[PDB]
Design a protein around this nucleic acid. Structure first.
Lengths: 259, 117, 70, 88, 104, 66
RNA sequence: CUUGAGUCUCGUAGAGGGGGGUAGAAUUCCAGGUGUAGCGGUGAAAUGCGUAGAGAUCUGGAGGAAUACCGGUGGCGAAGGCGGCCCCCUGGACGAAGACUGACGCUCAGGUGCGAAAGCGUGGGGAGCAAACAGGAUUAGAUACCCUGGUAGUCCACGCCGUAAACGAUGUCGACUUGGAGGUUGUGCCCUUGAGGCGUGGCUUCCGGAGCUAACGCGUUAAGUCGACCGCCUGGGGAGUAC
């Protein structure tokens, strides 16, 4: 009756758009496709690679619940964007938690700087930070035992584009993209960027707060022309890339991957 | 002749023939060479190789001036564009600036009519 | 496309950079375009035709894609 | 176009209520004034054809209005044409 | 009457004469009960390209609510005056009293 | 992803040279609305501003000219 | 009487029109410097320009014409058409609310006006381009295509001409009939918590349903379902010609 109308606004009230409410129960597993049902119009074709943790093998059997993401509806048939990004929000929440007590503590282990800041990895994910953040002083973890255990003390974060440089060792110590496009500029600043869509000439890795990068086909590997970028890297994956070129005018930052 | 350390190389690259002219920084031409002059005619002189050899010839010609530094100004569309500069480099000048100086009007004069072939 | 060779920069690299700059400018293309007079009508026609082609590529092909080849 | 103040003045004079504005007579007056204004312009600028089209249209409209007035109420029309000095 | 925005560029050798010129311009505006809402000597400035062979010039911004006759007169003065290289009287909707982004 | 919609500007200013400089080429040319992602309404205004600047020698018409 | 039609208020976007200024690039020519044998052109050549110093290159000057980028199945205009920037004069469109007028409307034979390009007249101008013309090729020939030159003309003023595949090959005005993806330009609300969310108007591009259609296709911008008025067709040629 209005039973159904009320039930509709009820079901509106008991779901939200992003990957927030851990609701999809894994109702069929087959390599290489997981699939859930979070109270959406259809079931997700999940990769297996959004769900294996830190050494390669699966972690969740039938009935298990992770939220995914949304705001994109129907490409022909199907429903979602991946739950792994979901996870990013959780990471953001832990990073935010720092603010409360002015100190987020986990483990951060940063061996080296792709682009001037040691890389820190938290749980499954690994992030890149600006060069200062790795060390509190001028200590430098190059003399430290390789891939050492500390935590991360945050030095610097870019707040829009996601780059976070964190503080290893020293426990005792405690319009918008395009005007100032000189931060990752200078010749070869390495970046960690998720690829988006590979347009048979390109790969379109673009992460640093509303920009566009290409890594088109010529570098990508150490073979030139026979490569076909879909075979050689991925879809949706955070990779090794650096700038090689910026035009701040005809917004074409032309990144590379042969480095 | 007065020796000069730094100068310009003007590379007039047409569809039919490349012309390389080495000059001082002020404008006064020191030497020049062409693909047509280098012993290439018609099909041959409208090629990168021809351009390169013209460039080489030009370089040879301005040996007595003792030119070390060189800025390149590349004009027009042609094969003799990249090749010529490479040749120049080989000949052994420190290439300082590489400028493009193609005359692009901002819609000015009417071009000649389109060929019917 | 004005360029200056950086200190301890290779020649080849510089050349490549220059080429890239030129490409960006679209100087050669521009030159090609202005070689001969294009009647206004012709210009119009090309533009519209090109647009049409683009549209065809975008939508019809997308529709095709939905169905598998084998 | 006709300046706001001028328009207001025109309305006040011819319009009975002064808030009315849409009275036939008032409208006619407005048209007439505009036409008068544009005469000066068109003396200067004889090749301004596009602009003249608008003027022509306005004139036509005025004529129509006059015609309408005539059938409805003759005396009023007569008065109007005395005021404005319209030959017909 | 009509809110104009004027920017004129003086020859850099006549930079010491500029204030007087400005004053004169103001005076004329005042004469016809014209207001002058902002006035900004930008000073000596490097030109993006060398107009009339010279590389720097002295820019003056000036916003004015004046009748058009006076504007015309001003324009005429500018054209004949050899100190002022370029001018650009340019209409505006409102008074725009707040300062320019290059002054700030 | 237009800047002027977000800022919410009433009119683009030719005097605001820095802003303009983001939308102009290394070669001096005005950058397309595809690349910048500027809104159409604003784009025209921006172009106009640039043109004005060029007239006032605030921006250059081109890189080569002198 | 107020639903059609119009008037008033405030805004909005616009290559809409007319007039007058100005800017920068590029071509051409002139004067001069540097410099030395080629340049130019084509499928390949030659005519042509060059040692009387060309081409290249730099400096200065003259003058005309057009406005790169922006720029878009974008915008404006009744159509023709309209594109750097600035000012002056000026026409239309749309939206927001109200207020007013009170059928004042629609269509239109004759009539009147506007009407690309070429063309004509008189007077200016003349850089580039280029009918005609000349030479060089090509060819069996080449009164063409290609090359080197090149005059009317293109440009401005004021007149005339009154036609174009002046095309959406689709008269104008009004009403009604499933949808989707855009673009552009308003405007109301909403925590603009952000580039957004939900509407509501105008103009516009593409796809497609019913229906229609000889089919192709059209499809809320109809070529569907209807009404009002006008224009026009009646086998091909002869002929849009003769008188």
């Amino acid at each position: 009756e209005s039973f159904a109308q009320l039930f509709e606004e009820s079901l509106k009230e008991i779901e939200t758009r992003p990957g927030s409410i851990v609701r999809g129960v894994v109702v069929a597993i087959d390599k290489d496709v997981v699939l859930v049902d979070a109270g959406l119009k259809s079931e997700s074709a999940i990769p297996a690679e959004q769900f294996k943790n830190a050494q390669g093998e699966l972690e969740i059997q039938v009935g298990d619940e992770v939220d995914v993401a949304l705001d994109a509806v129907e490409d022909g048939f199907g429903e979602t964007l991946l739950s792994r990004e979901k996870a990013k929000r959780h990471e953001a929440w832990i990073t935010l938690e720092k603010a409360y007590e002015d100190a987020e503590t986990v483990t951060g282990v940063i061996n080296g700087k792709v682009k001037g800041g040691f890389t820190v990895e938290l749980n499954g994910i690994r992030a890149f930070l600006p060069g200062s953040l790795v060390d509190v002083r001028p200590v430098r973890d190059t003399l430290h035992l390789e891939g050492k255990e500390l935590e991360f003390k945050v030095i610097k974060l870019d707040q829009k584009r996601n780059n976070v440089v964190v503080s290893r060792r020293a426990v005792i110590e405690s319009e918008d993209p395009w005007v100032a496009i000189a931060k990752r500029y200078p010749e070869g600043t390495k970046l960690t960027g998720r690829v988006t869509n590979l347009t048979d000439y390109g790969c379109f890795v673009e992460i640093e707060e509303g920009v566009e990068g290409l890594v088109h086909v010529s570098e990508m590997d150490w073979t030139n022309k026979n490569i076909h970028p879909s075979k050689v890297v991925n879809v949706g994956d955070v990779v090794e890339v650096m700038v090689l070129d910026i035009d701040e005018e005809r917004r074409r930052i032309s990144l590379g991957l042969k480095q | 002749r007065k020796q000069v350390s730094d100068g310009v190389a003007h590379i007039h690259a047409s569809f039919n023939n490349t012309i390389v002219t080495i000059t001082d920084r002020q404008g006064n031409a020191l030497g020049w060479a062409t693909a047509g002059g280098s012993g290439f005619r018609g099909s041959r002189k409208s090629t990168p190789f021809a351009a390169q050899v013209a460039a080489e010839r030009c370089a040879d010609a301005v040996k007595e001036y003792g030119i070390k530094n060189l800025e390149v100004m590349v004009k027009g569309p042609g094969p003799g564009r990249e090749s010529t500069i490479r040749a120049l480099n080989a000949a052994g000048f420190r290439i300082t600036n590489i400028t493009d100086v193609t005359p692009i009007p901002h819609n000015g004069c009417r071009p000649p009519k389109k060929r019917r072939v | 496309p004005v360029i200056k060779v950086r200190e301890n920069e290779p020649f080849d690299v510089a050349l490549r950079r220059f080429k890239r700059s030129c490409e960006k400018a679209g100087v050669l293309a521009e030159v090609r375009r202005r070689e001969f007079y294009e009647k206004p009508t012709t210009e119009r026609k090309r533009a519209k035709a090109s647009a049409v082609k683009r549209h065809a590529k975008k939508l019809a092909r997308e529709n095709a894609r939905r169905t598998r080849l084998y | 176009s006709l300046s706001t103040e001028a328009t207001a003045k025109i309305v006040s004079e011819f319009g009975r209520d002064a808030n009315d504005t849409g009275s036939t007579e008032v409208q006619v007056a407005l048209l007439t004034a505009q036409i008068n204004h544009l005469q000066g312009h068109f003396a200067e600028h004889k090749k301004d054809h596009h602009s003249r089209r608008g003027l022509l249209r306005m004139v036509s409209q005025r004529r129509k209005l006059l015609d309408y007035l005539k059938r409805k109420d003759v005396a009023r029309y007569t008065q109007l044409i005395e005021r404005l000095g319209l030959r017909r | 009457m009509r809110h104009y925005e004027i920017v004129f560029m003086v020859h850099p050798d006549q930079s010491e004469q500029v204030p007087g010129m400005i004053e004169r311009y103001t005076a004329a505006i005042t004469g016809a009960e014209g207001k002058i809402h902002r006035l900004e000597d930008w000073g000596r400035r490097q030109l993006a390209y060398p107009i009339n062979k010279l590389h720097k010039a002295h820019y003056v911004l000036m916003n004015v609510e004046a009748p058009q006759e006076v504007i015309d007169e001003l324009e005429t003065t500018f054209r004949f005056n050899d100190a002022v290289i370029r001018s650009m009287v340019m209409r505006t909707k409102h008074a725009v009293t707040e300062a320019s982004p290059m002054v700030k | 992803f237009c800047r002027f919609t977000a800022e919410g500007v009433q009119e683009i200013d030719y005097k605001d040279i820095a802003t303009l400089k983001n939308y102009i080429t290394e070669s001096g040319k005005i950058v397309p609305s595809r690349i910048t992602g500027t809104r159409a309404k604003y784009q025209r205004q921006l172009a106009r501003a640039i043109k004005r600047a060029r007239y006032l020698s605030l921006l250059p018409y081109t890189d080569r000219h002198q």
